[PDB]
Amino acid sequence: MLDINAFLVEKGGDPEIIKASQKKRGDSVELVDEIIAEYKEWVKLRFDLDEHNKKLNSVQKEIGKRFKAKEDAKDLIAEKEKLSNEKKEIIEKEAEADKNLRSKINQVGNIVHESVVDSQDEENNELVRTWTPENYKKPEQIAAATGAPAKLSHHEVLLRLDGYDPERGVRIVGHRGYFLRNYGVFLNQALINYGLSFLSSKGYVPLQAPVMMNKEVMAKTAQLSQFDEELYKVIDGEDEKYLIATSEQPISAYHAGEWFESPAEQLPVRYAGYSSCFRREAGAWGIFRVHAFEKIEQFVLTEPEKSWEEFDRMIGCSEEFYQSLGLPYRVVGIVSGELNNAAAKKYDLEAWFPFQQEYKELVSCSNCTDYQSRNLEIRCGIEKKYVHCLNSTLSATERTICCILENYQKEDGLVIPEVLRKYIPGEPEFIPYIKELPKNT
Amino acid sequence: MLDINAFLVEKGGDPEIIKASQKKRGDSVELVDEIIAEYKEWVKLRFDLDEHNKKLNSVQKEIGKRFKAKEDAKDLIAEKEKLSNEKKEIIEKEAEADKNLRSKINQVGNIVHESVVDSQDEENNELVRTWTPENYKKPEQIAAATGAPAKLSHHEVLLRLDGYDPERGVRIVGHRGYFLRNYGVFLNQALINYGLSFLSSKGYVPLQAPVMMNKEVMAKTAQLSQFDEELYKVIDGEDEKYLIATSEQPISAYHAGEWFESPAEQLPVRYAGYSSCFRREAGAWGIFRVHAFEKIEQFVLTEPEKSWEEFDRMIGCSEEFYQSLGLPYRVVGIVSGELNNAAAKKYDLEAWFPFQQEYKELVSCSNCTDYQSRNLEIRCGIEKKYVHCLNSTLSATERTICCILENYQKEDGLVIPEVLRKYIPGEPEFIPYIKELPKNT
CATH class of the missing domain: 3.30.930.10 (Bira Bifunctional Protein; Domain 2)
Structure with missing residues (x-):
């Protein structure tokens, strides 16, 4: 299949050329726009995953501090588990987005x-x-x-x-x-x-x-x-x-x-x-x-x-x-x-x-x-x-x-x-x- | 597979030779006796089918006669349908016997x-x-x-x-x-x-x-x-x-x-x-x-x-x-x-x-x-x-x-x-x- 980056103008790609080609083939032209859109969702998921990682690491350090000072950490633990539960969802979505994106690209000649x-x-x-x-x-x-x-x-x-x-x-x-x-x-x-x-x-x-x-x-x-x-x-x-x-x-x-x-x-x-x-x-x-x-x-x-x-x-x-x-x-x-x-x-x-x-x-x-x-x-x-x-x-x-x-x-x-x-x-x-x-x- | 008649002494066959061979092969010897027994049942079915055919043809002629004379034929018709229903069963059994017999013979080396x-x-x-x-x-x-x-x-x-x-x-x-x-x-x-x-x-x-x-x-x-x-x-x-x-x-x-x-x-x-x-x-x-x-x-x-x-x-x-x-x-x-x-x-x-x-x-x-x-x-x-x-x-x-x-x-x-x-x-x-x-x- 084609490189993912071929679809991305911001990554040196040329989606217009892929659309023209699709048209010459008599194949779906919309597929190109669909790939680009799904790519952006995938990127949003990746960002969201990275932000959760950093927040999680952050709240971990605070929990360590709290325990060191022998102070209750129920509030931080709650935040940790919420960030964790969100991360789980994001991980699953990212995997699904990556899969669907690859399946779509695979359809393009x-x-x-x-x-x-x-x-x-x-x-x-x-x-x-x-x-x-x-x-x-x-x-x-x-x-x-x-x-x-x-x-x-x-x-x-x-x-x-x-x-x-x-x-x-x-x-x-x-x-x-x-x-x-x-x-x-x-x-x-x-x-x-x-x-x-x-x-x-x-x-x-x-x-x-x-x-x-x-x-x-x-x-x-x-x-x-x-x-x-x-x-x-x-x-x-x-x-x-x-x-x-x-x-x-x-x-x-x-x-x-x-x-x-x-x-x-x-x-x-x-x-x-x-x-x-x-x-x-x-x-x-x-x-x-x-x-x-x-x-x-x-x-x-x-x-x-x-x-x-x-x-x-x-x-x-x-x-x-x-x-x-x-x-x-x-x-x-x-x-x-x-x-x-x-x-x-x-x-x-x-x-x-x-x-x-x-x-x-x-x-x-x-x-x-x-x-x-x-x-x-x-x-x-x-x-x-x-x-x-x-x-x-x-x-x-x-x-x-x-x-x-x-x-x-x-x-x-x-x-x-x-x-x-x-x-x-x-x-x-x-x-x-x-x-x-x-x-x- | 071997000829059906190879199993039948009365048909010039040599079942003892097949048993000896089975034994040399380390395969089932009983299979030979089973084939012979199933063959006899098949033959009984064939005889029974032939007798039904002849009885059926016979009662058909009588029914023709009865109708010709303008006489009631309910008794003959009943006999006809009974012989017919029996023939159906025999036909089905004969087919099953023939199938099982062939499957058994197919197992003999x-x-x-x-x-x-x-x-x-x-x-x-x-x-x-x-x-x-x-x-x-x-x-x-x-x-x-x-x-x-x-x-x-x-x-x-x-x-x-x-x-x-x-x-x-x-x-x-x-x-x-x-x-x-x-x-x-x-x-x-x-x-x-x-x-x-x-x-x-x-x-x-x-x-x-x-x-x-x-x-x-x-x-x-x-x-x-x-x-x-x-x-x-x-x-x-x-x-x-x-x-x-x-x-x-x-x-x-x-x-x-x-x-x-x-x-x-x-x-x-x-x-x-x-x-x-x-x-x-x-x-x-x-x-x-x-x-x-x-x-x-x-x-x-x-x-x-x-x-x-x-x-x-x-x-x-x-x-x-x-x-x-x-x-x-x-x-x-x-x-x-x-x-x-x-x-x-x-x-x-x-x-x-x-x-x-x-x-x-x-x-x-x-x-x-x-x-x-x-x-x-x-x-x-x-x-x-x-x-x-x-x-x-x-x-x-x-x-x-x-x-x-x-x-x-x-x-x-x-x-x-x-x-x-x-x-x-x-x-x-x-x-x-x-x-x-x-x-x-």
């Missing part, structure tokens, strides 16, 4: 970066750049890597290759359930390992995260909507944890409570996160939108002064990865009304799906500045200064497989993307269709 | 194979065979692959290599939580991919299973104790699923309700299962006994006549895998009292851990005959004949890493097992210790 387009409608997303492989004329219903008619959807290609089983998957785990089979498995592993090797060659540290997280830690990195909507809860006898939606969650907390005190030397720290991911929300057929999938994630901590440059570097890394796979794409700047609480700015890389004949999101890249690091107490250098946290998908692997399937299909099977070959037993350049589909021409 | 040692005490496990690499003199406190003093435990080696993070892991997910880091990640992926390639070269079909399963399917393949003890439950709004303990669970159900009608040609079917695994029970330090880990599993369906030969083939496959990693081991035949419900026979491969100076289980191999396939209705050929199901660990990868760490350690770092090198970026032959431990000599 990060300050939307000035570059972001102000709109609630994704039709207004910024077209940042477009890339095509140089031998792919234009995005159309043609497989980019083969020049073949993009005749089959990703689900159909995968079925014909016998690379997954949605029917047995649904029987065993329900909605959108699936097994991967034979080359479906090898392709998924190839993307995971290629992804880890690609990032490690860029100095990222491979990090495989646990897929369960304690509630209290998760709550510090993820917004409310995410719990009562997005995350599966795990029951462990009497205890509960959450399954993660992305390794960004546990990895963001990896350095919680730590301090990069010599940041010129210690930062940036860059992690190639790997984990399975679980989402309660997944809506057609295929492994494009499912409840469980794997992701290689970039997660980076930087000095506050350097996060914007790193943002460009991280999307550049993802772009380079998709270029290496020969997949056409565009990069779009997401409108303000579509940012989650933590993001100050977000670019999506959306790759061309030639059967679908549309660009579909494969990557999101966000600068969350110090919104999470403040909660997680990840300090930077010598109120407090915190690191900036950025996250960017490298590959949601099953979804990336869908894009590969549509772009590498041809009449008799699938061409294997060159960079993935070394990661698959036999280093096949091509794998044939094994099965015909019921519906065909 | 698979018939323990005659080769299995009859005992409740693992000290009596059969020593089946022992293997050592030919340049490793004997199991002692010496790293088998390097000849170096096995000075460090697996946890210490992994710490010195900076290959995992138990401290940040525990903070984020609690008990035994961990991240894998750098080479810890690459080694885990290497074992997964080596394992898949090793089995696929043997004709196994790679199969990556979903890690969630619907309750009703899980209950058909896994015993009661497993739910109220072993499995995490997942909360999905109003619904619930389980996280799997091993890909053997969903893969055993992969062919549920299917029929291998030409088994000479269609069987055996062999799967190289891959998934993460989740266990509520994990007890020191390290990634040897943890709540979440990955496993490559052999899962095989065969004709009933061929399962014993396949059992030998499957343990042979696991042995060959450990031999290829240079890890000394022994194979032990688990005593009757230690078999789970489904296993008719189980071998554990236990690998030598030179720091621990003990053999520790890395592989279990079981022939479950048709105990699960009967529940899952997986038929074989032309009462009913079902396939046999066998399962054997190829590698619990994090645990296998522990064995590698102790056996490949030397004074200045870790030798990378030769077969894994091709799977790790840079194909390192050796990786140096990066960190010193607080406690040392």
Whole structure:
């Protein structure tokens, strides 16, 4: 969340900027005035507590004196007990005010970066750049890597290759359930390992995260909507944890409570996160939108002064990865009304799906500045200064497989993307269709 | 579970053999007599239902006649309604008897194979065979692959290599939580991919299973104790699923309700299962006994006549895998009292851990005959004949890493097992210790 002082003009803050941001987000603007008002009540309580402390200390000294002189102190004792009973009430109120103030601040989104387009409608997303492989004329219903008619959807290609089983998957785990089979498995592993090797060659540290997280830690990195909507809860006898939606969650907390005190030397720290991911929300057929999938994630901590440059570097890394796979794409700047609480700015890389004949999101890249690091107490250098946290998908692997399937299909099977070959037993350049589909021409 | 007819001597069954097996298991012997008694009550109910059907049909014809002749039928109508009211009761009882009978049978373990040692005490496990690499003199406190003093435990080696993070892991997910880091990640992926390639070269079909399963399917393949003890439950709004303990669970159900009608040609079917695994029970330090880990599993369906030969083939496959990693081991035949419900026979491969100076289980191999396939209705050929199901660990990868760490350690770092090198970026032959431990000599 934002610093309490950001709301307080008298403490160098900028509440007007927070109001403008709230408005761009399409979120409550009144919340800002409410926070400021509650802050003043909290301050009044603190003053009142301090005055009671001093009066109490004072009447204590008098009682000591009274007893020393062997004089009755009933009057002072009465005053003491009254001041004491008032102090009790004030302590309770201060605690309540502090709690409610923190809950309110927690509802306010990060300050939307000035570059972001102000709109609630994704039709207004910024077209940042477009890339095509140089031998792919234009995005159309043609497989980019083969020049073949993009005749089959990703689900159909995968079925014909016998690379997954949605029917047995649904029987065993329900909605959108699936097994991967034979080359479906090898392709998924190839993307995971290629992804880890690609990032490690860029100095990222491979990090495989646990897929369960304690509630209290998760709550510090993820917004409310995410719990009562997005995350599966795990029951462990009497205890509960959450399954993660992305390794960004546990990895963001990896350095919680730590301090990069010599940041010129210690930062940036860059992690190639790997984990399975679980989402309660997944809506057609295929492994494009499912409840469980794997992701290689970039997660980076930087000095506050350097996060914007790193943002460009991280999307550049993802772009380079998709270029290496020969997949056409565009990069779009997401409108303000579509940012989650933590993001100050977000670019999506959306790759061309030639059967679908549309660009579909494969990557999101966000600068969350110090919104999470403040909660997680990840300090930077010598109120407090915190690191900036950025996250960017490298590959949601099953979804990336869908894009590969549509772009590498041809009449008799699938061409294997060159960079993935070394990661698959036999280093096949091509794998044939094994099965015909019921519906065909 | 066992066939109902196995309990019925009059139906070609062998209840004495089931009693003997129960006794070997240290489970209830009385359960067998109880099942037989309840079966007879069920039969009595069925007879009574059939007699009521015939009487009812009979009195119906008379009522028709009576009405045809325009005669009063109050007497017949009364008899009809009485027979009807009795039929209602019988139907309800039959359903209850059938339910209780099935619940009882479900409690009876698979018939323990005659080769299995009859005992409740693992000290009596059969020593089946022992293997050592030919340049490793004997199991002692010496790293088998390097000849170096096995000075460090697996946890210490992994710490010195900076290959995992138990401290940040525990903070984020609690008990035994961990991240894998750098080479810890690459080694885990290497074992997964080596394992898949090793089995696929043997004709196994790679199969990556979903890690969630619907309750009703899980209950058909896994015993009661497993739910109220072993499995995490997942909360999905109003619904619930389980996280799997091993890909053997969903893969055993992969062919549920299917029929291998030409088994000479269609069987055996062999799967190289891959998934993460989740266990509520994990007890020191390290990634040897943890709540979440990955496993490559052999899962095989065969004709009933061929399962014993396949059992030998499957343990042979696991042995060959450990031999290829240079890890000394022994194979032990688990005593009757230690078999789970489904296993008719189980071998554990236990690998030598030179720091621990003990053999520790890395592989279990079981022939479950048709105990699960009967529940899952997986038929074989032309009462009913079902396939046999066998399962054997190829590698619990994090645990296998522990064995590698102790056996490949030397004074200045870790030798990378030769077969894994091709799977790790840079194909390192050796990786140096990066960190010193607080406690040392």
